[PDB]
Ligand binder design. Structure first.
Ligand code: HEM
Length: 129
């Protein structure tokens, strides 16, 4: 839809993820089954979001200089972008499951896998500066 809101929506999605990752990382440092489930409840909500309508063509850093970090490359690799998007949704399910199993070791392992997916996509599609 109107870029102004697509940007608005996608910024909220990532600030949300970023926050969750930061919180789960501290929890993994000092595992507590209860706080992991509260964090897992929040992450589950976030992943219900469809990122598909979030990257309509014409919203890259080259189209909206300084308003987004979305690399125009996304629009030449939408299939790979979707895959990295799906890969993330799956690692997160693993994290949620581990939290709910109360498995501090499983949860720590799943978190690494998840962080790996953030980096994989950012690596090819987000701009440093
Ligand atoms: C993994 C759970 C994951 C996290 C964590 C995450 C964080 C994140 C932040 C906080 C930003 C903010 C911008 C900044 O650099 O300050 C950001 C932005 C983008 N991301 Fe991301 N992100 C995670 C995962 C992924 C995945 C799976 C993808 C690609 C399929 C992805 C892509 C991007 C893109 C593109 C942006 C830029 C969006 C914009 O600036 O408008 N991220 N992410």
């Amino acid at each position: 839809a109107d870029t102004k809101e697509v940007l608005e929506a996608r910024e909220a999605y990532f600030k949300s993820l970023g926050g969750s990752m930061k919180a789960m990382t501290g929890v993994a440092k000092a595992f507590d089954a209860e706080a992991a489930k509260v964090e897992a409840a929040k992450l589950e909500k976030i992943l219900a979001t469809d990122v598909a309508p979030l990257f309509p063509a014409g919203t890259s850093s080259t189209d909206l200089p300084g308003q987004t970090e979305a690399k125009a490359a996304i629009w030449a690799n939408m299939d790979d972008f979707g895959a990295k998007g799906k890969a993330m949704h799956e690692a997160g399910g693993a994290v949620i499951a581990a939290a709910n199993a109360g498995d501090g070791a499983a949860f720590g392992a799943a978190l690494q896998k998840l962080g790996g997916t953030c980096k994989a996509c950012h690596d090819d599609y987000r701009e440093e500066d």
